[PDB]
From a paper:
The fourth structure reveals a previously unknown state, where the 5′SS already forms a duplex with the ACAGA box of [name] and the 3′-end sequence of the exon is loaded onto loop I of [name]. Consistent with formation of the U6/5′SS duplex in the ID B state, U1 snRNP is absent and most likely has been released by PRP28. Therefore, the RNA conformation already resembles that of the ID B state. For these reasons, this spliceosome is designated the late ED pre-B complex. The nucleotide G1 of 5′SS is sandwiched by Phe1551 and Gly1564/Lys1565 of the Endo-loop, reminiscent of that in the yeast endogenous tri-snRNP or B complex or the human ID B complex. Recognition of the exon sequences is also achieved by loop I of [name], which forms a duplex with four nucleotides (G–1, A–2, C–4, and A–5) at the 3′-end of the exon through non-Watson-Crick base pairing. Notably, the central base C–3, which is flipped out of the duplex registry, is sandwiched by Arg535 in the NTD and Phe1551 in the Endo-loop of PRP8. In the late ED pre-B complex, conserved helices α12 and α13 of [name] are anchored on the tri-snRNP through direct interactions with PRP6, DIM1, and the NTD of PRP8.
During spliceosome assembly, the pre-catalytic state (B complex) is converted from its precursor (pre-B complex). The RNA helicase PRP28 unwinds the U1/5′SS duplex, releasing U1 snRNP and allowing formation of the U6/5′SS duplex in the B complex. In this study, we fill an important gap by reporting high-resolution cryo-electron microscopy (cryo-EM) structures of the human ED spliceosome in four consecutive states: two pre-B complexes (mature and late) and two B complexes (early and mature).
Residue numbers in the entry:
A (entry chain 2I): 112 to 222
B (entry chain 2L): 7 to 95
C (entry chain 2K): 12 to 119
D (entry chain 6d): 10 to 59, 64 to 85
E (entry chain 2F): 402 to 463
F (entry chain 2M): 15 to 80
G (entry chain 2G): 300 to 328, 394 to 447, 454 to 485, 490 to 1304
RNA sequence: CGCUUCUCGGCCAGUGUAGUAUCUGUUCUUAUCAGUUUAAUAUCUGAU
């Protein structure tokens, strides 16, 4: 159990193409899948979503049939929350929904 | 001048030349190979297909890690494809 | 038929600290017209001098014969001066006037 | 310090040699080998009277009638 | 030393030596100006002179 | 080291060090299923409301900086 | 000053316009250009007077030219006369001054003190001790400058280097070093270099664009170190004006600069700049550059270009349509390079590019044309073989019509294309067989090509891939007949080509008759070798090992040549034939031609008296591989004969010998090892021992492993007793290999035997052998692992003594022992002691001595896994906040190392901490009690 | 090459990259305060 190393939350596409995996914080990686020559499951090489100082509440596979896939990282930044001597940023931050988007052709993953 | 690339660890098997051949990469050592090397095709590509993870020659074999670096769990950090001071590629 | 490095300047050394522009101008005067001269007058550069001519081939004839030439009891180190280096103590500015001038008279 | 003649023949092995009989005959070919009696094995040897034949293969030349050996 | 110099973030203060500046940076008052300014201490901000630039640098930090 | 969070240096403040170990306490508590269930039992809630609460307390703990 | 700078540029070209126009109307009607006293106060440094001797003096000067022709033609000649000196001129230096260099180091022709800056310049001639002198001088002086970095400051330095890194006559070694100084001081100065940055690149960039491979890589290294070292906006604001600089050279290079600075600071930092450039509407020359930049970015950043791919391209498209040509040209060229880093990716990002490209293909004449190919070709792999299908089918035409050009840029291009076009899965076999081949082998395979380097390679590749498709016999059939063409490099080429092909495709396809033509060939080539080259040799080996028992009828002709050659032809060619045996051993075996094995065994055996090293080496090699096929007890020179026959060779000094020998001795003393009576061995031991003077690693490598093999044959005590005596004078870690013997030995019978001998031998007062025994334990535990669960006790007190000081080295090496032990034991339950030792370790924590420290870091890391954190952390609490800096530095470095691993464990082990006013440091959770 | 004599023997000053350790020589225990600096000193920076 780490703070930064994935395996905590786990999500995966309807079409099974690719699967996203994430820690709680800072790391979201993605493994792509395609069945082999004989249709036996071959695993891609990883990728990276990294974004600093960001809390991932929960992640969920998304539905787009045969597209570049999407994912939902529920997030929050705490970086506002540190550099606020007061304790205002403690409140008055809202957790940020972001959809990441795998993109095969380019093969990186973009907010 | 000579230090790691530590880009993310892919599925690509490592490749070592004649010279480097015995060496557990980080512990520098021949002892007790057990487990296997992975680097990013970013680090490992093309002219680097079967290239030495050290010297820039053709890979004749596959670096095995020691056990020593194993229990200290270092093999799982960024891909040990050494970049020299000059453009690695 | 010439090496590119050599330039209208020569570094010139092994001089006495009494020595005369009269001597100098005369001797060097052989090969060709003097653009001008400098003499190190300063705590370090006392003893050396620069020489520059209206032509290189002038100077070529110079470093040719004057090579190791004698004055008094000393053999003068005779060298083609380097360049670039420390000059930028000045700046290139003062085009504007002049190039307006060629801009003007000849109209070109 | 002395240069032995058999040592001189030894080093011309695998080279081209001219072998000059005591007669008016001569052979040039590659020196393959020799014995103590200086019988001689030549390869692809031209035979001359001072061109008689082009030999192909190996010739044993009887050391008996040999007079001069010439490397080259 | 004894060469004219100035730190902008500290009271537009004057310093007479370049070796002196590093010592000033690892200093009580210099870090008080940074931290009380909202620019947190130690080693990223060492090369600071003016107050302005390290503000965008600290925005780059957080 | 730097891009690996929780790294310290000799300038490390009291406050930061402790907030660190808070957070890590948490990703453990979300981690170790049982430990979690322990909490749940004691103070009566859902598993969920636990994890939720925690993930609130993540950025805060100890309250504002100094 | 920047604005000023560019002002000076627009100046410069306005001037060239004035002159060039002056000879434009003057032609309607350089360095020698006359000078002004401001211009004349511009060159020479500070500190010189101009003169006048006299207006009569300077009048004769004014008279000089007119009287240079005039008095060039007049009377003179010079007459010597036959007839207490002084004044010894002071020249040279400890590393000495070349004659030319006087100009730089002149101020070391003065001898003074009491001048202050000038004492810093006059002290910076430490350079000369860099530039010339002895190696040690270079070293020490070099550091002395490094730590004097901050102090003198860049300004004085670069003021005093760049002349030398500009030296018309500067040495290559001198170059590379003076680079070393520029890097090294650039590890330090950061903010400092700003005013100097351009004033650096101007020297360096030439180096980056460098014929020498190692030159370049240095260059890039430092241009990053600078660019990252300086600031981004520094780099930019610096380097615009070189873009439009008249000289294409400085542009060209200026690009590769921007390539590097971009590898440093990332593309996206720099994009909006580029993207600005390619939309510059003033002039094209820029755009020619900016595009180039895109390229060299492509090449350098390579596989990593991927993400901003789309943006980059979104720059470059607006070129292809341009009115100017080059800009088209270079542009497309970039697209190529992109794709070549793109590989099979980002296809549609290139997407909007194509449709011009294809059209462009049609209408062209010239270098540009084939360039567009260079692209498309690198595209096709990226398409869908249905879309790619179509588009392919269009190209292979133009490709056809274009084989024939005289241009070489061309033939490279169209070549690499075919690799890709017909290098495809979705292309049909026959079609190649018909249209392409006959041209292909026609125009390309010619002697123009192979003499050149690249074309050689690129060719081989291409032909290979046409094999991977249309089959083997097709190709090889057509190029066999050329092994017997005379000139070498050509032959070499056909040879390697084939070698690969029967590499990939396999021999199995080849017919018969053709095959006769092979082996007849591959001898005929092999019989004539200008140098000895791996090519024909390997190429052969592969030939055979592919043909397998199809080969068998051909031996007698082989081994016949193998011997014949083997002899004579004088010795240079010998080693070759030797190797030839080396590789074909396996084939001589399984087919069971034993008379052959009689032949080889024995006749090689004779040569082992050959005096040339470079034969005997290859000879043994052959022997080794001969052993790996026929077992010991069937060896025709039965080992008893052999192995001693080797034995005396080991003096041989020369390399290749020592290698193949010790190798051989090893195999045999491993495998048979009974054949030879013990006495002989112990002679072998006392001969091995000084093989440990080997400059080389591999020798010592197998050397050791042998030392073990025999140590098995005999039994331990002696062989360590004997090793105890050895390696007395090994220099700086040279002997260690002996220690490695103590180790491996100590395994290969129960170490549980050997210790008492060893331990006791740490008694001896001689210091360095003491530490020796310590390492012995080190490698020892590293090699034993689990087993340590016993003898641990034995060492522990000893580790206490050694670990307590005599000197550092004791603590260093010993501590290492703690490491490898601490891992090996793991979790069998012997911690207690290891805790105990932890104490005597601990204080060592503090030191600057790099080896001692990285040693200790070794220790405590391992010890962590053995003891567990909680104990460790209980040494690391107090340290964190200790007022001093020194301690906090370290206890933090430790606590990190504890921290990264086993972060998951800790939670338990942070102690309770009382909450203050603004905050709560007590984690209340854990105290919830059911 | 053979024989005879005598002597002896065998068997039943390399190099390269990085880095530390350790002697000796030379200078200072010496006036106040203000800043930089240090765990505290020290050290460094100004004037009477």
């Amino acid at each position: 159990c780490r703070r930064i190393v994935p395996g905590q939350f786990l999500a995966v596409d309807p079409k099974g193409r690719a699967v996203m995996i994430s820690a709680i914080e800072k790391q979201k990686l993605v493994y792509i899948l395609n069945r082999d020559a004989a249709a036996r499951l071959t695993i891609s090489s990883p990728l990276e979503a990294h974004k600093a100082n960001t809390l991932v509440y929960h992640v969920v596979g998304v539905d787009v049939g045969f597209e570049n896939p999407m994912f939902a990282c529920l997030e929050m930044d705490y970086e506002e929350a540190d550099n606020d001597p007061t304790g205002e940023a403690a409140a008055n931050t809202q957790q940020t929904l972001t959809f990441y988007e795998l993109d095969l052709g380019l093969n990186h993953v973009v907010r | 001048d000579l230090i790691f690339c530590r880009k993310q660890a892919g599925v690509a098997i490592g490749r070592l030349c004649e010279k480097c051949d015995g060496k557990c990469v980080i512990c520098d050592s021949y002892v007790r190979p057990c487990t296997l090397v992975r680097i990013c095709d970013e680090c490992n590509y093309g002219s680097y297909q079967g290239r030495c993870v050290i010297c820039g020659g053709p890979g004749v074999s596959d670096a095995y890690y020691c056990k020593e670096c194993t229990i200290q769990e270092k093999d799982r950090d960024g891909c040990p494809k050494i970049v020299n001071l000059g453009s690695s590629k | 038929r010439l090496p590119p490095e050599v330039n209208r300047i020569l570094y010139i050394r092994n001089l006495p600290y009494k020595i005369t522009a009269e001597e100098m101008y005369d001797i060097f005067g052989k090969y060709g017209p003097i653009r001008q001269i400098r003499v190190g007058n300063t705590p370090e550069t006392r003893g050396t001098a620069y020489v520059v001519y209206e032509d290189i081939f002038d100077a070529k004839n110079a470093c040719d014969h004057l090579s190791g030439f004698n004055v008094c009891n000393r053999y003068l180190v005779v060298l083609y001066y380097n360049a670039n280096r420390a000059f930028q103590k000045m700046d290139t500015k003062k085009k504007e006037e002049q190039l307006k001038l060629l801009k003007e008279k000849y109209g070109i | 310090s002395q240069l032995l003649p058999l040592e001189l023949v030894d080093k011309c092995i695998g080279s081209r040699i001219h072998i000059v009989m005591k007669s008016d005959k001569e052979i040039v070919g590659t020196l393959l080998g020799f014995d103590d009696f200086v019988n001689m094995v030549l390869e692809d040897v031209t035979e001359f009277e001072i061109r008689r034949i082009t030999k192909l293969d190996q010739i044993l030349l009887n050391g008996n009638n040999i007079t001069m050996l010439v490397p080259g | 030393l004894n060469i004219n110099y100035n730190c902008e973030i500290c009271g537009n203060y004057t310093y007479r030596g370049p070796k002196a500046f590093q010592r000033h940076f690892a200093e009580w008052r210099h870090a008080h100006g940074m931290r009380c300014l909202g620019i947190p201490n130690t080693a990223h901000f060492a090369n600071v002179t003016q107050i302005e630039d390290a503000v965008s640098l600290w925005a780059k930090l957080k | 080291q730097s891009k690996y969070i929780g790294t310290g240096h000799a300038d490390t403040t009291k406050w930061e060090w402790l907030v660190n170990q808070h957070r890590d306490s948490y990703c453990s508590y979300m981690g170790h299923f049982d430990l979690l269930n322990y909490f749940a039992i004691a103070e009566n809630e859902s598993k969920a409301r636990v994890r939720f609460n925690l993930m609130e307390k993540m950025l805060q703990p100890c309250g504002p900086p100094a | 000053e920047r604005d000023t700078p560019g002002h000076g540029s627009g100046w410069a070209e306005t001037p060239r316009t004035d002159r060039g126009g002056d000879s434009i109307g003057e032609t309607p009607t350089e360095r020698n250009r006359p000078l002004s006293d401001e211009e004349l106060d511009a060159m020479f440094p500070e500190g010189y007077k101009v003169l006048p001797p006299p207006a009569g003096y300077v009048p004769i000067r004014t008279p000089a030219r007119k009287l240079t022709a005039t008095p060039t033609p007049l009377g003179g000649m010079t007459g010597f006369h036959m007839q207490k000196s002084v004044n010894d001129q002071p020249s040279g230096n400890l590393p000495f001054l070349k004659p030319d260099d006087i100009q730089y180091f002149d101020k070391l022709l003065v001898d003074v003190d009491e001048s202050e800056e000038q004492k810093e310049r006059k002290i910076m001639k430490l350079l000369l001790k860099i530039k010339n002198g002895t190696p040690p001088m270079r070293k020490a002086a070099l550091r002395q400058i490094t730590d004097k970095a901050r102090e003198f400051g860049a300004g004085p330095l670069f003021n005093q280097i760049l002349p030398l890194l500009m030296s018309p006559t500067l040495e290559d070694q001198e170059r590379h070093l003076l680079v070393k100084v520029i890097d090294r001081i650039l590890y330090k100065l950061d903010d400092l270099v700003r005013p100097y940055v351009h004033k650096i690149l101007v020297v360096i960039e030439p180096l980056l664009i460098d014929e020498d491979y190692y030159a370049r890589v240095e260059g890039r290294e430092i241009i990053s170190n600078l660019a990252k070292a300086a600031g981004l906006a520094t780099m930019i604001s610096t380097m615009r004006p070189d873009i439009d600089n008249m000289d294409e050279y400085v542009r060209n290079t200026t690009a590769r600069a921007f390539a590097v600075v971009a590898s440093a600071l990332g593309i996206p930092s720099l994009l909006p700049f580029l993207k600005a450039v390619c939309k510059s509407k003033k002039s094209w020359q820029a755009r020619h550059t900016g595009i180039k930049i895109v390229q060299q970015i492509a090449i350098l950043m390579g596989c990593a270009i991927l993400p901003h791919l789309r943006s980059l391209v979104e720059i470059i498209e607006h070129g292809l349509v341009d009115e100017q040509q080059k800009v088209r040209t270079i542009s497309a060229l970039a697209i190529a390079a992109l794709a070549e880093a793109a590989t099979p990716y980002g296809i549609e990002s290139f997407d909007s590019v194509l449709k011009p490209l294809w059209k462009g293909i049609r209408q062209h004449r010239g270098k540009g044309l084939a360039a567009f190919l260079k692209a498309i070709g690198y595209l096709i792999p990226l398409m869908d073989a249905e879309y790619a299908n179509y588009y392919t089918r269009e190209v292979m035409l133009i490709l056809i019509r274009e084989f024939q050009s005289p241009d070489e840029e061309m033939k490279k291009i169209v070549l690499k294309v075919v690799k890709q076009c017909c290098g495809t899965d979705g292309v049909e076999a026959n079609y190649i067989k018909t249209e392409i081949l006959p041209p292909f082998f026609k125009h390309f395979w010619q002697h123009r090509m192979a003499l050149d380097r690249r074309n050689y390679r690129q060719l081989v590749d291409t032909t290979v891939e046409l094999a991977n498709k249309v089959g083997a016999a097709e190709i090889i059939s057509r190029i066999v007949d050329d092994l017997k063409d005379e000139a070498e490099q050509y032959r070499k080429m056909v040879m390697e080509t084939i070698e690969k092909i029967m590499g990939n495709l396999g021999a199995a396809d080849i017919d018969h008759k053709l095959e006769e033509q092979l082996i007849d060939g591959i001898l005929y080539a092999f019989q004539e070798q200008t140098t000895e080259d791996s090519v024909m040799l390997n190429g052969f080996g592969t030939v055979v090992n592919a043909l397998g028992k199809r080969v068998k009828p051909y031996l007698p002709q082989i081994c016949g040549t193998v011997l014949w050659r083997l002899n004579n032809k004088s010795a240079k060619v010998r080693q070759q034939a030797a190797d030839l045996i080396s590789r074909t051993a396996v084939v001589m075996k399984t087919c069971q031609e034993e008379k052959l094995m009689g032949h080889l065994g024995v006749v090689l055996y004779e040569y082992l008296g050959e005096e040339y090293p470079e034969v005997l080496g290859s000879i043994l090699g052959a022997l080794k591989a001969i052993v790996n096929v026929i077992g010991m007890h069937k060896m025709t020179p039965p080992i008893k004969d052999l192995l001693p026959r080797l034995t005396p060779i080991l003096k041989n000094r020369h390399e290749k010998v020592q290698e193949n020998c010790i190798d051989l001795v090893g195999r045999i003393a491993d495998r048979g090892a009974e054949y030879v009576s013990a006495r002989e061995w112990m002679r072998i031991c006392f001969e091995l021992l000084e093989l440990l003077k080997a400059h080389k690693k591999a020798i010592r490598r197998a050397t050791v492993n042998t030392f073990g093999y025999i140590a098995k044959a005999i039994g331990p005590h002696d062989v360590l007793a004997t090793l105890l005596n050895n390696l007395k004078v090994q220099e700086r870690q040279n002997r260690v290999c002996t220690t490695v013997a103590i180790a491996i030995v100590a395994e290969t019978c129960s170490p549980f035997t050997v210790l008492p001998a060893l331990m006791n031998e740490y008694r001896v007062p001689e210091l360095n052998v003491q530490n020796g025994v310590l390492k012995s334990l080190s490698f020892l535990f590293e090699y034993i692992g689990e087993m340590g669960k016993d003898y641990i006790y034995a060492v522990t007190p000893l580790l206490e003594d050694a670990l307590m000081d005599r000197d550092l080295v004791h603590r260093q090496t010993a501590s290492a022992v703690v490491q490898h032990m601490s891992l090996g034991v793991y979790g069998f339950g012997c911690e207690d002691s290891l805790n105990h030792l932890l104490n005597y370790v601990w204080p060592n924590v503090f030191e600057t001595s790099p080896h001692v420290i990285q040693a200790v870091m070794g220790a405590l890391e391992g010890l962590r896994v053995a003891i567990g954190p909680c104990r460790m952390l209980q040494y690391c609490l107090q340290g964190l906040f200790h007022p001093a800096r020194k301690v906090r530095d370290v206890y933090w470095k430790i606590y990190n190392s504890i921290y990264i691993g086993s972060q998951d464990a800790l939670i338990a082990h942070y102690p309770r901490i009382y909450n203050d006013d603004k905050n709560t440091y007590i984690r209340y959770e854990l105290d919830y009690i059911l």
